[PDB]
């Protein structure tokens, strides 16, 4: 006879999808841009941004701290400090959902200060080098 | 004299950012933070984030975009679906790592077809041929 076994020696195989994490983030951004399953609105000086709490906690120490408190976890509207610049925040939000940080002369300091407020020190460190 | 920061319209690309985000999502899941759905596969329960499920699976994408069934928190998969196969695919969604052992290869493959994860199925088809 002969025995057809898919992995004979009771083997232990793993497939690593080298672009999976990138594929997921793009789909998260697609959901965000179509307002699907977004569960918080961040308000930055009368401007509104819709987002997923999980993505915010993954990227920002500030949001990680807010949403690890149970009392604060089921908030659906967060008003950032009035000092924070809407354009700076929109650039950091796009960074969270796309891995890309866009800097033009005239918003570099805005992105940088927004990044400390959100406690994204790795972004801040990369911004500091950028000068 | 005028000290101006540039005007090179620049973009910084963080090449491990998406991988970092996914790991943090997996950490949130394992600490049961903000998971919002329970998937029931033959009496067995799996907690997850809907957005991650919609990102990876056409089946779940279709459920959670149904306008009427907006408040679903429990999904009962068909009785035929194998809990172990589903768990491997769930770890795959959160880690980019698909773990196959002798004895569950077909289960993962068929479950992935049910979940409409065609790219995973194709990778499995390549897998069992060699």
């Amino acid at each position: 006879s002969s025995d057809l076994y898919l992995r004979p020696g009771g083997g232990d195989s793993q497939i690593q999808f080298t672009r999976h994490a990138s594929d997921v983030l793009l789909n998260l951004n697609r959901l965000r841009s179509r307002d699907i399953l977004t569960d918080v609105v961040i308000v930055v000086s009368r401007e509104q941004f819709r987002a997923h709490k999980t993505v915010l906690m993954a990227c920002s120490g500030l949001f990680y701290s807010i949403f690890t408190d149970q009392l604060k976890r089921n908030l659906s509207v967060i008003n950032l400090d009035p000092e924070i610049n809407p354009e700076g925040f929109n650039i950091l939000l796009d960074f969270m959902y796309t891995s890309r940080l866009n800097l033009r002369e005239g918003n570099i300091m805005a992105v940088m200060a927004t990044a400390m407020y959100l406690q994204m020190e790795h972004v801040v460190d990369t911004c500091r080098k950028f000068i | 004299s005028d000290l101006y920061l540039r005007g090179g319209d620049s973009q910084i690309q963080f090449t491990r950012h998406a991988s970092d985000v996914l790991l943090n999502l997996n950490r949130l899941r394992s600490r049961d933070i903000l998971t919002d759905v329970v998937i029931v596969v033959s009496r067995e329960q799996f907690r997850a984030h809907k957005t991650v499920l919609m990102a990876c699976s056409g089946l779940f994408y279709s459920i959670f975009t149904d306008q009427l069934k907006r408040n679903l928190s429990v999904i009962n998969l068909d009785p035929e679906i194998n809990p172990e196969g589903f768990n491997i695919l769930l770890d795959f969604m959160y880690t980019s790592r698909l773990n196959l052992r002798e004895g569950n290869i077909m289960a993962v493959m068929a479950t992935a077809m049910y979940l409409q994860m065609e790219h995973v199925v194709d990778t499995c088809r390549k897998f069992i041929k060699a």
């Binding site: 497939i15 690593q16 080298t18 594929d23 697609r30 | 699976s57 980019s96 994860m117």
Partner: peptide
């Protein structure tokens, strides 16, 4: 035993 898959891993949700 690890194998690297480099193609797209999941469906692409459309714009």
């Amino acid at each position: 035993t690890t194998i690297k898959e480099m193609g797209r891993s999941i469906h692409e949700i459309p714009r």
